[PDB]
């Protein structure tokens, strides 16, 4: 938990609580349950993220007009990592100059792990600037939003020959796809290793030129995300339902008995992984004592999950004993096997009931989380997802926030929590002086929890 300032992502990364936990108690006490290995994948809701480049020139007279570099200058930037010292619309130059000379791009040390930036004049007048940064696009990938907040109505996978299976909504005269385009590895290096990219797309914005490398959708995007694998899974069969339970899990899954076609295109990016995961669980756990029963069956859970199932059946007790080491003896072993199977089915039924016992508790705790998320959404979401998550309350939704790590040694806590500007009012949490990385302007925020630094309106209260 480093000292950090967490800011909300412009209102874009919204999340909300919904009563999506449904409990259906299985009625029959039928005890011939199947055993097997299970892997569960969830529908991928997260947005596809890809790198883009943003080319701009900066005119200052502090008005700081941003303008699009000409496309030939864009080619100069991409091929030589150099930019020309002039811009024309009638003509302007660097301060007190007329050279129209070439300039070598150098790193802007003020730039971060997002929006890594390169400038020709390090003056942190006319400047030339190239930002390399992220962009996100949610399914259907018909538009993407870059980290700088610009929205582009073009599919990140439109390759100039598939507008029937993609989207293009920006101005046609300002869009250019380039086969086998050569771009340098690092704009900040005087000499860098050039790299060819199959299809590179450019779009001339009003104040910018945005470029991105077009890739194959089915090859870069996967609509299913692996959630979890259960090695000891039991399954109860109804007339039109399979009910999956796991002893280590507090969640049970329910699906119809009709299976999903495993040779479907939507499973192409998860099929081999899931199959090998099942095979690994068999090899490391059941290769000796069990045997595979049937093939891999794919089911779609009522809640939308995708289940890959491998049934397993334990070897007969004669084989188990031989690995650990006449008709009447065959009858004795048959009676032993019958007794073992009966009691094992009893155990499996009990385990299934125990697994079902968690649902009401989980539903009530979900309502508890929803109520508590209005007071501290970040703590509640961090508890739910088991990772540091910052969130803000936005009425009926929560906004996810992203945290910028600060100097970590500039954090000075003020000694006086009394609001000098207003007698009778006191700060709720102590005020902090801090500095951003590679920066010197002292900032005033308020100390939060888990080393978080708060900004905006300071929390105040009565001086009790």
């Amino acid at each position: 938990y480093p000292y950090r300032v967490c800011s909300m992502a412009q209102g874009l990364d919204l999340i909300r609580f919904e009563r999506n936990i449904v409990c259906t108690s299985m009625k029959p006490i039928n005890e011939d349950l199947d055993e097997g290995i299970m892997v569960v994948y969830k529908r991928n809701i997260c947005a596809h993220t890809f790198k883009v480049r943003v080319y701009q020139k900066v005119l200052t007279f502090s008005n700081t007009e941003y303008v699009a570099p000409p496309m030939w200058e864009i080619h100069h930037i991409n091929s030589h990592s150099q930019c020309y010292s002039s811009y024309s619309r009638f003509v302007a130059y660097h301060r007190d100059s007329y050279e129209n000379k070439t300039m070598q791009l150098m790193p802007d040390d003020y730039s971060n792990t997002c929006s890594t930036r390169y400038v020709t004049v390090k003056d942190q007048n006319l400047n030339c600037m190239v930002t390399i940064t992220t962009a996100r696009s949610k399914y259907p990938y018909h538009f993407f939003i870059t980290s700088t907040g610009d929205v582009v109505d073009i599919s990140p996978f439109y390759n100039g020959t598939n507008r029937n299976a993609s989207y293009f909504g920006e101005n046609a005269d300002k869009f250019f796809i380039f086969p086998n385009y050569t771009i340098v590895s690092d704009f900040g290096r005087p000499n860098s290793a050039l790299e060819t990219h199959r299809l590179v797309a450019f779009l001339e914005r009003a104040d910018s030129v945005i470029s991105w490398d077009i890739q194959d959708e089915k090859n870069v995007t996967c609509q299913l995300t692996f959630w979890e694998a259960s090695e000891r899974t039991i399954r109860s069969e109804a007339e039109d339902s399979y009910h999956f339970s796991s002893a280590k899990m507090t969640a049970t899954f329910l699906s119809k008995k009709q299976e999903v076609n495993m040779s479907d295109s939507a499973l192409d990016c998860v099929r081999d992984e899931a199959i090998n995961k099942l095979q690994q669980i068999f090899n490391t756990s059941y290769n000796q004592t069990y045997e595979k029963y049937g093939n891999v069956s794919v089911f779609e859970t009522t809640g939308g999950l995708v289940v890959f199932w491998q049934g397993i059946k334990q070897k007969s007790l004669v084989e188990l004993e031989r690995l650990a080491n006449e008709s009447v003896h065959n009858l004795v072993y048959a009676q032993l096997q019958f007794t073992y199977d009966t009691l094992r089915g009893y155990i499996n039924r009990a385990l299934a009931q125990i697994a079902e016992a968690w649902c009401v508790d989980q539903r009530r705790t979900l309502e508890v989380f929803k109520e508590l998320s209005k007071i501290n959404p970040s703590a509640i979401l961090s508890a739910i997802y088991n990772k540091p998550i910052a969130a803000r309350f936005m009425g009926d939704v929560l906004g996810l926030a992203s945290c910028v790590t600060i100097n970590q040694t500039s954090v000075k806590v003020l000694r006086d929590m009394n609001v000098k500007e207003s007698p009778g009012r006191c700060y709720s949490r102590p005020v902090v002086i801090f500095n951003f990385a590679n920066s010197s302007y002292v900032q005033y925020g308020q100390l939060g929890e888990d080393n978080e630094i708060l900004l905006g309106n300071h929390r105040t209260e009565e001086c009790q």
């Epitope: 100039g160 507008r163 029937n164």
Partner: antibody, heavy 118, light 107 residues
Framework: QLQLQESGPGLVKPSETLSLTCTVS??????????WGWIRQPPGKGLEWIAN???????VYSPSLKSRVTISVDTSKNQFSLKVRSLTAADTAVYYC????????????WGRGTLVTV | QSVLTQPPSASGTPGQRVTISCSGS????????VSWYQQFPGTAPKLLIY???QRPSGVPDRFSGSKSGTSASLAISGLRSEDEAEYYC?????????FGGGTKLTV
């Protein structure tokens, strides 16, 4: 899905004007549609491009038919029209409405040929 | 306009390689990209080669485009009964589009 359908008359006199109109469906004639053009094909002979028009009305004509061919666009009705003037027997042809839809392609989407007999 | 010269017909046996030429001029076919369209009788033309030597998705590898100076070429390899069509070479000349004369092919 760039459906493209013509609405021309089948029989026209060898005089006055042939008016052809092409209607777009599944999309719209907008700032992201490149050009929309007309092509003739006399029966049993090769194709011949007539004219192109853009969404903003900027139009280009073939050198030979520029005087005898007018082209217009109506983005409100998602249509565009050819008017051919001073018709002759040699204007008897199948007329195809076509366009550029993808970036790399030139004439990838073609309409349904309207046979005009002069 | 400057119509691109193209053979009026071509033919070959099934399984043979057929070549269709397109002469043009330096200002028309040498500079701009050349496209090839396959039209079957009574049907609208279908794009067969979009750039000089690039096939749209689903156009068989049997078809290949090429250019040499001004002369563009299409070649059909392993010719099939369903290749009987008119092939049109088309490109820009001066802010204007021009098709070829169309080689009717017979198997």
């Amino acid at each position: 899905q760039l459906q493209l359908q013509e609405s021309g008359p089948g029989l026209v006199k060898p005089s006055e004007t042939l008016s052809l109109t092409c209607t777009v469906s599944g999309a719209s004639i907008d700032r992201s549609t490149y050009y929309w053009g007309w092509i003739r094909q006399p029966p049993g002979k090769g194709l011949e491009w007539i004219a192109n028009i853009y969404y903003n009305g900027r139009a280009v004509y073939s050198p030979s038919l520029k005087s005898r061919v007018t082209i217009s666009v109506d983005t409100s009705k998602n249509q565009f029209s050819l008017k051919v003037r001073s018709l002759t027997a040699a204007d008897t042809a199948v007329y195809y409405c076509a366009t550029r839809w993808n970036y790399f392609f030139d004439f990838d989407y073609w309409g349904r040929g309207t046979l005009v007999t002069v | 306009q400057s119509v691109l010269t193209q053979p009026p017909s071509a033919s070959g046996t099934p399984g043979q390689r057929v070549t269709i030429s397109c002469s043009g001029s330096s200002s028309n076919i040498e500079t701009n990209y050349v496209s090839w369209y396959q039209q079957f009788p009574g049907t609208a033309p279908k794009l067969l080669i979009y750039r000089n030597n690039q096939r749209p998705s689903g156009v068989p590898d049997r078809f290949s485009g090429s250019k040499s100076g001004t002369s563009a070429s299409l070649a059909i390899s392993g010719l099939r009964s369903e290749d009987e069509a008119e092939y049109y070479c088309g490109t820009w000349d001066d802010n204007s589009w021009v098709f070829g004369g169309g080689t009717k092919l017979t198997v």
